[PDB]
From Swiss-Prot:
Coiled-coil regions, chain positions: none
Role according to the record: Essential protein that may act as a regulatory protease that is conditionally activated upon appropriate environmental triggers.
Free-text comment on this protein's domains from its UniProt entry: The periplasmic region consists of a protease domain (PD) and a PDZ domain, connected by a ten-residue linker. Interactions between the PDZ domain and the catalytic domain lead to an inactive conformation.
Species of the source: Mycobacterium tuberculosis (strain ATCC 25618 / H37Rv)
Record-given protein name: Probable serine protease HtrA1
All ranges on the Periplasmic side of the membrane: 1-293
Full-protein positions shown: 226 to 528 of 528
């Protein structure tokens, strides 16, 4: 058996098909078993339509052996494009082994593994092409668009392996394939999954700013398109046409990195925003709000 053949074969039983059907429509993706009690991780696109219209969709999980079981949505985070499902009282689950995405390096060989029985299923191979790479993702349903800090790979990521794991050569999960490919890194997945399992929700920081990217000799970064009334940004003295170049401890190259950087701030704690305003460099202070005040 070949090098990749062995790794794909070792993790196949941890990968599942997730199917959502209404009497009008029927969509399908992959996901990975992450906990022996039957917790399954996928991306938020895969279950979005069912989560938004639960009265008309039924979600099932199909195992490598072909068993089909009903699945319940535990919680989801459109901002990180992740979701968690739960199957009840299924025995002898092959739980995926979760790696450490902070140890992943550019050039590392990977498999992007889709669920073996999915209709369009794919397994692809490549390397890690970049780390900590902000990438915009369009929201599936009425879901908000977002940006994630991704693992980039030249393994093809397509309908047939999205929601499945990105697997390293130790056959460990180093990320979740999104919907020139990108994976949500496993260290972030673990933090978001933990939260969705407990609370059924994740609370992210918000400033009330929308930005557009600017690149030139005077100041490159995320130029402020809009500031929400009453927002942390309004209260902290951020102005439209300000060019944001640093948010907290993270330099901000463009509007994509701005989105990711905000989400690394502490809720309720003062933080520096560096701005270029009418040719001058200004540091403001902002106290981020929770995006969901009642779950904070």
């Amino acid at each position: 058996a070949g090098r990749f053949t062995k790794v794909a074969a070792a993790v196949a039983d941890s990968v599942v098909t997730i199917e959502s059907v209404s009497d009008q429509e029927g969509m399908q993706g992959s996901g990975v078993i992450v906990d022996g009690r039957g917790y399954i991780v996928t991306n938020n696109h895969v279950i979005s339509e069912a989560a938004n219209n639960p009265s008309q969709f039924k979600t099932t999980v199909v195992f490598n052996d072909g068993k089909e079981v009903p699945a319940n949505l535990v919680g989801r985070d459109p901002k990180t494009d992740l979701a968690v499902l739960k199957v009840d009282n299924v025995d002898n689950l092959t739980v995926a082994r979760l790696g450490d995405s902070s140890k992943v390096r550019v050039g590392d060989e990977v498999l992007a593994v889709g669920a073996p029985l999915g209709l369009r299923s794919t397994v692809t191979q490549g390397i890690v092409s970049a780390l900590h790479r902000p990438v915009p993702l369009s929201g599936e349903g009425s879901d908000t668009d977002t940006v994630i800090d991704a693992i980039q790979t030249d393994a093809s990521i397509n309908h047939g392996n999205s929601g499945g794991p990105l697997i390293d050569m130790d056959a460990q999960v180093i990320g979740i394939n999104t919907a020139l490919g990108f994976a949500i890194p496993v260290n972030e997945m673990k933090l978001v999954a933990n939260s969705l399992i407990k609370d059924g929700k994740i609370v992210h920081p918000t400033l009330g700013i929308s930005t557009r990217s600017v690149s030139n000799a005077i100041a490159s970064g995320a130029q402020v398109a809009n500031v929400k009334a009453g927002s942390p940004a309004q209260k902290g003295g951020i102005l439209e046409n300000d060019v944001i170049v640093k948010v907290g401890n993270r330099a901000v190259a463009d509007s994509d990195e701005f989105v990711v950087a905000v989400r690394q701030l502490a809720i309720g704690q003062d933080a520096p925003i560096e701005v270029v305003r009418e040719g001058r460099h200004v540091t403001l202070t902002v106290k981020p709000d929770p995006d969901s005040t009642l779950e904070h």
